[PDB]
Structure 1
Amino acid sequence: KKKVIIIGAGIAGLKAASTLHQNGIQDCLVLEARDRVGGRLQTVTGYQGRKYDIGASWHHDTLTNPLFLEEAQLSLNDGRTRFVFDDDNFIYIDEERGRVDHDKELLLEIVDNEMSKFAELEFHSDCSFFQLVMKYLLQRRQFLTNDQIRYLPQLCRYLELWHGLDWKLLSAKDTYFGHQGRNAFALNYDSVVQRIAQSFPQNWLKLSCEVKSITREPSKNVTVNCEDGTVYNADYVIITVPQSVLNLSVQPNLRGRIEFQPPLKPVIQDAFDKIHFGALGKVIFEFEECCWSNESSKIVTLANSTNEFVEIVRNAENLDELDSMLERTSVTCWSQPLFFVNLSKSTGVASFMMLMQAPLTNHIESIREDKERLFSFFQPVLNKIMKCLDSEDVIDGMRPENIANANKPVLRNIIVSNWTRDPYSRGAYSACFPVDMVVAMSNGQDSRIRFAGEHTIMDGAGCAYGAWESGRREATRISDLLKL
């Protein structure tokens, strides 16, 4: 009854629809499991109507990012502000010393560069970003001070926030990856979603439709059917659900899962072994008003470091001696690095958007509803930030004020992501464990069972534009064929 059925209203799915329609193509559908489009792009509303992208929030590689360029043109055309360039000089904070960024004697960023060049060279078998950092420290200790060896490895972990994976879980071979230029903070990714979503017939979209199985009818027909009984049949099928969800079509009923008939060709099934997903998480701390210095919009808190980490480095005879000397509990805000976006400086909002990673993410998302517990967990670093930003310890104003505020940051609310605990996202996005999936998805189960999504592309992989393009790809293809 339909031409092509798009599964998923994320930006990939939306783009595909947007394209088809842009090609006159008619009679198509977008089946979304949730009661909203946007997929991993969701803007939520907090205190006083402040808006926040709980999922994606940046246009990466603005130099080449084609989705960003389109937004840029729209803005050049109507003057509407769609994004702001928020890259800033990062501020790094260690519980003990405090600020360790742009340091006269620590010069951490410079060694971090060397560390980077080292990794480029090292490759050009693959270990963990952690192991790699350790190899470097060992291999260059002769040229590193005691303080550099202490904090450098901590500071360099900000990369855990780019992947949303701790350094012992992260692939070093994929850890470093130069970005094609500055980043632009989307002042409404929801505008992008809304703009694309309303660029095709609104009657194509069918929300709360969890597709349970895709059956191939050799007779040049495809049987799609949401688990609510309703069955559809279209010429072509573009599957845009997350890799983590798709990755369920190979296990022995779980929600979101799509039963493929016939099974997914092996090449694809193998890929799920050579590619994993990450768990980047977000916590929004909403303050009554800014009462801290807006020196920068990017702040990173370093996990605790031990002056006895040095002695071990200063001793190991090799990666085996060091490897063992290392294996020689409790999880707090200081157990890992935490990336804080000070929205006050870059968007004029008295809030902090903090990014977290696996394994911490999953745990904090677990207690998303426990505000007193959440505040208690982040209070230390929150206060450590305010001090460094010439302010006072945070007051808890989440419940009906204090009067003793005025000069003290008054927390009014906290918003936590829920991607790990959401059955339709089961994670943040494609991430590397210490590749081929791109091809497996690009080719497609067949001439009519295509794949799209941030995990189905090489350029922009794991990104909004990467997904946006993959949606136009598989689309523009099915656009010409049908056109016939």
Structure 2
Amino acid sequence: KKKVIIIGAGIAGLKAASTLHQNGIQDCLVLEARDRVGGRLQTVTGYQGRKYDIGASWHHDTLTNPLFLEEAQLSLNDGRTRFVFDDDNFIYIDEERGRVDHDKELLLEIVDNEMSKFAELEFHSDCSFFQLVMKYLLQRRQFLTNDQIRYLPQLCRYLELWHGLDWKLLSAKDTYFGHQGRNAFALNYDSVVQRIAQSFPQNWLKLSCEVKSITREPSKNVTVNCEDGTVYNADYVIITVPQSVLNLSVQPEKNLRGRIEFQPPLKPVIQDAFDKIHFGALGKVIFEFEECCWSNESSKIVTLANSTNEFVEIVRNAENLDELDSMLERTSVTCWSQPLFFVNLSKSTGVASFMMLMQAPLTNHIESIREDKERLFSFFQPVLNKIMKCLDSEDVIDGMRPIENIANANKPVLRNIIVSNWTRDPYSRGAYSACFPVDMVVAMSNGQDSRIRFAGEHTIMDGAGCAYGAWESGRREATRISDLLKL
């Protein structure tokens, strides 16, 4: 029947569909399991109609990001605001100390820089980012004060919100990575998705179509089966489901929502690749306040996990990486058990809200209780008040239920909380490609064969794990299949 069948309507699949059409191609399809397009790009709506990207929210590498450049030109042509450069000077908050950023005596950003060059030098075996930070501290303690030894490691973990992985689950070798310039906050990624999706025959889109299996016949024809019985046959097939999903293609049984049974099975180089690449769990929590009543100094605030001086003496005393490694091994998870990244939306978008980013293992636990508004307010209440105090304000009032308080005005009134759910959603099963302490790109880039091709943020190297990477990978596979068929 069809020329090419695109599986998944994330930005990868959408771009691909866009290309094909743009290449005059016809008779294609976009099969999406969810009842909406966008995949890991979703803009939700909350209090008083405020909108928030619960999925991707920034255009990274604006100096070379091609998706971003395209958006910029559109904006040069029509003056519509599509984004805002929200990079800012980070505010770091510790529970006891308070602010420790731009400190006259702590000079933490400066040692962090050094720490980073140290990381580049170490490589230029591989351990965990946590293990790398310990070596650094050990090897440079002679030139680090006691307060730097205490806090630096906590501040430097802000990188956890970059991969969505705690410093002990994260590969040190992939941790530090330069960026091609500032970041631009998308003021409607849904506008990016919408545009691409409305640039090809709207009749190609088939929502709520979970694909159960993909089969390779002899007669250069591929057969796709959505689990509702309906079956399709096409020339080429572009698979864009998340790596975490695709990975299911090689496990016991075949049920598990999302899993696609391949026929024949996926080659060994492919299945091998899943052994050398994991997936992160970046999550988000939106805190909607009645109105801003705090200082809008910065739009970037990070709260540090708690630290101790007992940790220092062990740095001072340890003789080597083993004495320290063994001395360190010497519960209760709260809002102060890990670093939390808060985007203060008031300064950058004028919205009285906080977009907080979180990592594994915390993400999954918070998303598990996403419907428990009071439990959620109780869990983050401490860091929220600590933030408000540092930003010259008061403790948060809970106004999530009818009948505010009448005596607010000077106190931040929380009106709502929104939480992501990517780790519990079967069609995402996590946030995006991440490294545990490479080859998948090549595996995907080639394909299962000349007609069973792939695409997605995990099928490319430039822009890996990013929206534009997935966007481009969608064009790659697209352009190709196009050149041929066209004939």
TM bin, normalised by shorter chain, reads: over 0.9
* 1:249 Cα deviation from its structure 2 partner: 0.2
Whole-angstrom distance in 2 between the partners of 1:391 and 1:16: 49
Per the alignment, in what secondary structure is the counterpart of residue 368 of structure 1?
coil
Whole-angstrom distance in 1 between the partners of 2:395 and 2:310: 30
Per the alignment, in what secondary structure is the counterpart of residue 300 of structure 1?
strand
* 1:357 Cα deviation from its structure 2 partner: 0.2
Per the alignment, in what secondary structure is the counterpart of residue 29 of structure 2?
strand
* 1:182 Cα deviation from its structure 2 partner: 0.2
1:234 aligned partner: 234
Question: Residues 302-360 of structure 1: CA distance to partner in whole angstroms, max 9, x if unpaired?
Answer: 00000111000001000000000000000000000000000000000000000000000
Whole-angstrom distance in 1 between the partners of 2:83 and 2:481: 32
Question: Residues 413-434 of structure 1: CA distance to partner in whole angstroms, max 9, x if unpaired?
Answer: 0000000000000000000000
1:151 aligned partner: 151
* 1:195 Cα deviation from its structure 2 partner: 0.3
* 1:12 Cα deviation from its structure 2 partner: 0.2
Whole-angstrom distance in 2 between the partners of 1:254 and 1:286: 35
1:479 aligned partner: 482
Per the alignment, in what secondary structure is the counterpart of residue 275 of structure 2?
helix
Whole-angstrom distance in 1 between the partners of 2:69 and 2:283: 27
Question: Residues 238-267 of structure 1: CA distance to partner in whole angstroms, max 9, x if unpaired?
Answer: 000000000000001110010000000110
* 1:465 Cα deviation from its structure 2 partner: 0.1
| Residue 373, structure 1, aligned to residue 364, structure 2 | no
Question: Residues 138-169 of structure 1: CA distance to partner in whole angstroms, max 9, x if unpaired?
Answer: 00000000000000000000000000000000
2:182 aligned partner: 182
Whole-angstrom distance in 1 between the partners of 2:405 and 2:134: 48
Whole-angstrom distance in 1 between the partners of 2:218 and 2:262: 14
In the alignment, structure 2 segments of 5+ residues that lack a partner are none
Whole-angstrom distance in 1 between the partners of 2:310 and 2:454: 50
| Residue 447, structure 1, aligned to residue 450, structure 2 | yes
1:320 aligned partner: 322
Per the alignment, in what secondary structure is the counterpart of residue 119 of structure 1?
helix
Whole-angstrom distance in 2 between the partners of 1:443 and 1:318: 45
TM-score normalised by structure 2 residue count: 0.99
Whole-angstrom distance in 1 between the partners of 2:66 and 2:26: 26
Per the alignment, in what secondary structure is the counterpart of residue 248 of structure 2?
coil
Whole-angstrom distance in 1 between the partners of 2:319 and 2:407: 57
Question: Residues 41-61 of structure 1: CA distance to partner in whole angstroms, max 9, x if unpaired?
Answer: 000000000000000000000
Question: Of 414, 420, 425, which aligns to 2:428?
Answer: 425
Per the alignment, in what secondary structure is the counterpart of residue 335 of structure 1?
coil
Per the alignment, in what secondary structure is the counterpart of residue 249 of structure 1?
helix
In the alignment, structure 1 segments of 5+ residues that lack a partner are none
* 1:26 Cα deviation from its structure 2 partner: 0.2
Whole-angstrom distance in 2 between the partners of 1:40 and 1:275: 19
Whole-angstrom distance in 1 between the partners of 2:191 and 2:284: 20
Whole-angstrom distance in 2 between the partners of 1:288 and 1:255: 39
Equivalence map 1:162-311=2 (5 Å) = 162-252=162-252, 253-311=255-313
Q: How many matched pairs?
A: 484
2:418 aligned partner: 415
* 1:404 Cα deviation from its structure 2 partner: 1.6
Whole-angstrom distance in 1 between the partners of 2:73 and 2:259: 38
Whole-angstrom distance in 1 between the partners of 2:56 and 2:96: 32
Question: Residues 246-297 of structure 1: CA distance to partner in whole angstroms, max 9, x if unpaired?
Answer: 0000001110010000000110000000000000000000000000000000
Whole-angstrom distance in 2 between the partners of 1:218 and 1:13: 26
| Residue 402, structure 1, aligned to residue 420, structure 2 | no
* 1:386 Cα deviation from its structure 2 partner: 0.2
Whole-angstrom distance in 2 between the partners of 1:3 and 1:348: 47
* 1:362 Cα deviation from its structure 2 partner: 0.3
Whole-angstrom distance in 1 between the partners of 2:267 and 2:335: 44
Per the alignment, in what secondary structure is the counterpart of residue 461 of structure 2?
coil
Whole-angstrom distance in 1 between the partners of 2:408 and 2:215: 61
Per the alignment, in what secondary structure is the counterpart of residue 277 of structure 1?
strand
Per the alignment, in what secondary structure is the counterpart of residue 447 of structure 1?
coil
* 1:218 Cα deviation from its structure 2 partner: 1.8
4+ residue runs over 6 A deviation: none
Whole-angstrom distance in 2 between the partners of 1:471 and 1:114: 38
Per the alignment, in what secondary structure is the counterpart of residue 413 of structure 1?
strand
* 1:475 Cα deviation from its structure 2 partner: 0.4
Whole-angstrom distance in 1 between the partners of 2:192 and 2:155: 33
